[PDB]
């Protein structure tokens, strides 16, 4: 028998026994293993179904948007300026955060894809021939020197990893290893940053993954141009421990588990079904 394949049902007949598979006790914390071959008469079914879609690698291994960055070729305010930054976190989007918060601890590699589009800013004229735009997405490790402005020396990236990409081609992509200092990524942290139980409470004190800096490598354009970089994360080689109950209430903040009080489900009119 293959692994992942669900169990077949055996044939059963009528019984008159002192055995009681239906009568149990859920006070023990034990979920009963009653199959339909215990409370009725079944036929022999050969079941070819497989649990391939339900694996942790298949359930997590889709690329999901985690951040939408914005930067222009000419500065109007801040935001948006000629460059922008992003502290790496998986908690600004609701879809991947709820998928990750079904487990307490995790361990995975990371594949990062950027979809960098561009559009012309609103002006009185647009007729201008422009060369192809080149972008840089520098990764600054925790503690390193951050770019203070445009044309800064820190974009020389002698040890920091950095990608260059010209518009029109395939999206860029690079793989990341497992970057935690402990043995697993903590999705939750019931604790504080200081030993006196003050400071920051929650998972914010544990996530320290560095920043991600974006800019145009072209010096200028004729007329200004806004640009949007979408970050896509796909976990791979995933391990997961201690499953949590699923999040019911909608999130409010990217650094907190805070919530407004919601009902447990939706309401109906009466507890009984009524028709014939």
């Amino acid at each position, epitope marked *: 028998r293959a692994v992942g394949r669900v169990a077949d049902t055996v044939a059963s007949g009528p019984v008159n026994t002192e055995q009681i598979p239906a009568l149990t006790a859920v006070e023990t914390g034990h979920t009963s293993q009653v199959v339909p071959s215990d409370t009725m008469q079944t036929r022999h079914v050969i079941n070819y179904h497989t649990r391939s879609e339900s694996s942790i690698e298949n359930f997590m291994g889709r690329a999901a948007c985690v951040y939408i960055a914005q930067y222009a070729t*000419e*500065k109007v*305010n*801040d*935001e948006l*300026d000629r460059y922008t930054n992003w502290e790496i976190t998986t908690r600004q989007v609701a879809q991947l955060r709820r998928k990750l918060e079904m487990f307490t601890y995790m361990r995975f590699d990371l594949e990062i894809t950027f979809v960098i589009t561009s559009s012309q800013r609103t002006s009185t004229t647009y007729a201008s021939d422009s060369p192809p735009l080149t972008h840089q997405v520098m990764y600054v490790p925790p503690g390193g020197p*951050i770019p*203070k*402005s445009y*044309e800064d020396f820190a974009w020389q990236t002698s040890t920091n990893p950095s990608v260059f990409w010209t518009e029109g081609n395939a999206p860029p992509r690079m793989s990341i290893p497992f970057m935690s200092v402990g043995n697993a990524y903590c999705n939750f942290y019931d604790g504080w940053s200081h030993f006196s139980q003050s400071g920051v409470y929650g998972y914010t004190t544990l996530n320290n993954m560095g920043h991600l800096y974006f800019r145009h490598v072209n010096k*200028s354009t004729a*007329y*200004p141009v806004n640009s949007v970089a979408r970050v896509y994360f796909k976990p791979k080689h995933v391990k997961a421990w201690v499953p949590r109950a699923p999040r019911l209430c909608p999130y409010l903040k990217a650094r907190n588990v805070n919530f407004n009080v919601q009902g447990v489900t939706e309401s109906r009119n009466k507890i009984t079904l009524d028709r014939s």
Partner: antibody
Amino acid sequence: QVQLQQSGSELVRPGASVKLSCRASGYTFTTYWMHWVKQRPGQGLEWIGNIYPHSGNTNYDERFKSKATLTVDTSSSTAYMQLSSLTSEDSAVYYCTRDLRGFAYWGQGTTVTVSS
Amino acid sequence: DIELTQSPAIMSASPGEKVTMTCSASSSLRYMHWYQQKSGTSPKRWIYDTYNLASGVPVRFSGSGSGTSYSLTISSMEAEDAATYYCQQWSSNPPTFGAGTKLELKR
């Protein structure tokens, strides 16, 4: 070091077009926003007008509209902040600050009164 | 509606105590800048991007502030910390910021 200072003006015979001069030359030329912060003796910090040298896209503020002309001249590297049709309220110290991420490179500020 | 300035007008602190700051803005923000205006010359830049740095600011200075309330907290005052502090926010009608948070050295 960003050189050097800004220059102050005295009371002029009425009706002329006043004009300051900011000698901000630590350039790094020329794609930046010279935002002109203003300040009264009541220590209130608001803005007068900015410019952009690559295009000419000047800006203003609701008290100093009609008219504060600030034309860019990169060969002189200067930045003007005087407003036409102004009144006697503008007795104020006049900053002419080049740009960075915040308000990093400020000016020393010149006080100019106007009346008769 | 809608005016924006610092919360305390005139404070007083000795070199050796806490200097915790509170401000108000008429519009929300993502970044926040903190300055120091001494009597006699132009002000200077002390904190950008709500925490990052300055040129001459020592390690004892700290800052925060998001949206409509700022906080540029000094952990320990010294004799070189007597200046007025104002905010900054770029807009789309910049708010405007405060006039400066006055303080005097206590003895």
